[PDB]
């Protein structure tokens, strides 16, 4: 199926406590394969998946230099954006960046993306056409004019629909034993009385990969959009994911409720009833 490669960057200014903390992570689909932490001891881009370790020293020298230049670039931008928004030098602020590309099962380019944030809010983003920018406020428009004049979109596009796709294809080939598997969800239901007259029906889904999933509780055809507790999808720590959803039903009416599970590794939507 489709695949993605995405890089995530976080720069947090430490006012009067040293240079800003910089953490970078590379993903193929939902599998981390590289990382960099400014507070770690190696001060180099480090492997985090088995299939990336075969890359040679010239690969790890290049990724180390590039990830450090991204860190230095964020240092400037932390001070620059602090001036755009008329903020004091005393506060801690955050710049977050994400970019990457998607390919199909045939390896063809599907889309590229780049989005930047400041203090957890949209700052500037590249449009899907990979040619124009969208700034979130008038301060970020200053950056947009600076990047339009420098023709940053053209150079970034050459990576997003070119080099990014090239390496993603190589990674998918080098890790074809671990990156091209979809595990279907193991499902089960539990029943927990909260009193003599009401009970909590909880619908479970375990060991599914990728993380995308949908759990909905129905009651006599109608869907309980509310009256339904749904937790966020969570990692198991082994490559798979978990999620549950629960509803409080009257005791003796459990047979009128149905849970529905939708995953890509399932040939049909699973329907469960207590």
């Amino acid at each position: 199926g489709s695949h993605s490669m995405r890089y995530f960057f976080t720069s947090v200014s430490r006012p009067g406590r040293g240079e800003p903390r910089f953490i970078a992570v590379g993903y193929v689909d939902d599998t981390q394969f590289v990382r960099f932490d400014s507070d770690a001891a190696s001060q180099r881009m480090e492997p985090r998946a088995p299939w990336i370790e075969q890359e040679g020293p010239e690969y790890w020298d290049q990724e180390t230099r590039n990830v450090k230049a991204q860190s230095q670039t964020d240092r400037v931008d932390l001070g620059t954006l602090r001036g755009y928004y008329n903020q004091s030098e005393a506060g801690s602020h955050t710049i977050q960046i994400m970019y990457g590309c998607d390919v199909g099962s045939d390896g063809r380019f599907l889309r590229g993306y780049r989005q930047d944030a400041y203090d957890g809010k949209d700052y500037i983003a590249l449009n899907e056409d990979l040619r124009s920018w969208t700034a979130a406020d008038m301060a970020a428009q200053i950056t947009k004019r600076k990047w339009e004049a420098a023709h940053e979109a053209e150079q970034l596009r050459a990576y997003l629909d070119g080099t990014c796709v090239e390496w993603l294809r190589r990674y998918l080939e080098n890790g074809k034993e671990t990156l091209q598997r979809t595990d279907p969800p193991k499902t089960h239901m539990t029943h927990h009385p909260i009193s003599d007259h009401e009970a909590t029906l909880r619908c479970w889904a375990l060991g599914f990969y990728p993380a995308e999933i949908t759990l909905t509780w129905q009651r006599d055809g109608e869907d309980q959009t509310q009256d339904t507790e749904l937790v966020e999808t969570r990692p198991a720590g082994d490559g798979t994911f978990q999620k549950w959803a629960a509803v409080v039903v009257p005791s003796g009416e459990e047979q009128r409720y149905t849970c529905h599970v939708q995953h890509e590794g399932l040939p049909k939507p699973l329907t469960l009833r207590w």
């Binding site: 890089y7 590379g26 881009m45 690969y59 290049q62 990724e63 590039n66 990830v67 230049a69 991204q70 230095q72 670039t73 400037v76 931008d77 620059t80 954006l81 970019y99 930047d116 700052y123 500037i124 950056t143 600076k146 990047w147 420098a150 940053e152 150079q155 970034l156 990576y159 080099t163 990014c164 390496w167």
Partner: peptide, 9 residues
């Protein structure tokens, strides 16, 4: 692999 182009904001 990582992109190697940085224009300041």
């Amino acid at each position: 692999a990582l992109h190697g182009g940085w224009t300041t904001k």
